[model samples]
Target: GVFRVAVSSMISPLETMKGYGPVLSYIEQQTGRKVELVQRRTYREVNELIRENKIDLAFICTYSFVEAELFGARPVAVPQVEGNPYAQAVVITRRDSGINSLEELRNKRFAFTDPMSFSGHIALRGELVKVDRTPETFFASTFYTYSHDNSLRAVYDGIVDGATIDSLVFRSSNILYPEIGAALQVVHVSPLVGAPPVVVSPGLSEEDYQLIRRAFLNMHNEPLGKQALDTLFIDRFVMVNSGHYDYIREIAGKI
Candidate 1:
């Protein structure tokens, strides 16, 4: 039977679909069960789908996964990027905006990708707390664009004075979309937060969970898997402990 799997549209819908399409196909081929690629415009939609068991598997932001884990989502594997299972959050502003520090962002319009984005939302909030501020009282105004690329674009187009996003997204966009870099400058960056997790619903039998995990961990060795991974800038997938994301819990508490 074909099973629905969700990936967040945190980038452009077209790129998210294209980047993950091959990996989902590889999983389908490896498991001999059709894998249906599913996504929503927002991270919360995908997270809720996993929580309700409407979706069997998902690639979700670390913040959302942290929240989802409490409701029976289990970690299957996480991607390794540039040889680490971690990445950072970056705060950015237009190059000509003259915002040089997190403090300089006060009373400035800001953009967030999603409330549940570790890098895009929480990490930036953590930065505010470091300086004794809160989102409600710090920025002049704010909005959620639902996509990290959109958040960056908001800054690039001067829709917002500043924004935060997954560093990997920012870096990849610089190469894939040079205009992003040319238009913005990073003002603040958070410590390496945990990377997003590839998770499965708790309702899934243990055997099936292991089957999916094995498919991902070994995907890089397969030709289609390799190509899929390369498109998404993933080095490989590694088995993850829930504890690796515990740091996010602490940060989440503060934010």
Candidate 2:
């Protein structure tokens, strides 16, 4: 059987392949097994697959990653970018939207990337909670794009007044779509929480797990591996544990 690796919907599948395609091929090469890639519309679906033992490994979002750990999944490695093992939630708006502050977002349309999204849904909503409000009761209208790029695009095109997305995606977005990056302005950068991670499902053998983990940790050392990491906007892959995400887990209950 092939090594089934799932890359969840932290971004659109198109961007996933664009950023992760080389990483996938590198894994296939290193594991000495055919790597079968899987993409789902929601992190919940991928988390379900991880819980039910249907997925071998998954590269997933932080919100769902925290939830997935409750069901026997284990973090193998987390990608490091700019020397940090964490990510920030960023609320953004079009530069010309004239919405310069979070208070200005009141009763305005908003876009969330996914329901089980930290930067997109949870962290931003947590800010509202601190102000004694909720997205349902606060925003005049809201929608989920299920992809960060679309959420950012929604704000850029004025489909929504504003949107929140992960800082990692925010930075990469600037690189992928120059116009959106140039036009969008950050209104808020919330506290740091753990970044997304590569995890293994319950039934993966210790040997197989270590093999994959080593591939990731050692990837940055090799020429092709360095190239793959570079395109993904990741500097390297390093150790991380559930404790690193305690803050995110605590912040999820508000929404």
Candidate 3:
């Protein structure tokens, strides 16, 4: 059977294919299976692929992965980014917007990527929950941009007063597109959340699951894999279990 792969683009939708190409290619060749790639606009849609047994594997966000686990999708490996296995959700605003804290965002338009996005969506609410506020009541209005880039762009272009996004996206956007990046400022950083992870459908046998895990865990040492990691700004894929994501469940319970 073909090895099906689905990626939830809560990060960079524009660079999705480009950034994922080499790593996916490496996985394809290492596993020696013909690969089929899948895409969905929303994180919830990608999580659904796991529940319906529509895909063999997926790269999914922390929030989606937590829910996807309910259906028996097993997390195989997690991307270790810039030497850390954890990533955080962050809120952003334009530098000139005079928004220095989450408090300043009150009664101002905001952007979110997907409802299941930990960094782009839920994490923002998690912050509000602590202060006894709700999104509808705190922000003047909010809309989904469906991708992290658009959320950032909305803030940069003055379309939204603030946005929450993956921390890495904020860091990498500065390097990849400084002009737009320079205009943005970090208004808040949400608590640590597990980085997105690669998961396998439960039907895969033990040996097959290990095949995928080993292939990813060792990808960084291979010359070709090194470049692919660079393309994605991943230092390596490290073995991680479901425990890595428990904190997300704690946050989700609140918002």
Give the winner by lDDT.
2
lDDT of 2 by residue, 1-255 (tens): 687788765565657778877887888788878777888888889898899988799988888887888888988999898888888988999899899988899999999988888888988777777888989888999999887888988898889999988887889889988977899999988888888899999999899889988989999997779889988878899998778788787777655
lDDT of 1: 0.84
TM-score: the better of candidates 2 and 3: 3
Can you write out model 1's per-residue Cα lDDT over 1-255, one digit (the tens) per residue?
677888766565667777888888888787888888887877788878888899889888888888888899988889999899987888998888889888888899999888888887888776677778888799999998888888888898888999888888898889988867888788887877668889998789989998988988998899988988988879999988667787788877886
- For each candidate in turn, the TM-score is 0.92, 0.89, 0.92
Candidate 1: C-alpha RMSD to true structure equals 1.9
Q: Which 10 consecutive positions of candidate 2 have the poorest summed lDDT? A: 7-16
Better of 1 and 3 by lDDT: 3
Clashing pairs for predicted structure model 2, backbone only? none
Query: What ordering of candidates by lDDT runs from best to worst?
Result: 2, 3, 1
How much RMSD separates candidate 2 from the native structure?
Answer: 2.2
For model 1, the stretches where C-alpha displacement exceeds 4 angstroms are none
C-alpha lDDT values of all predictions: 0.84, 0.86, 0.85
Error in Å for residue 158 of model 3: 1.4
lDDT of 3 at 18: 88
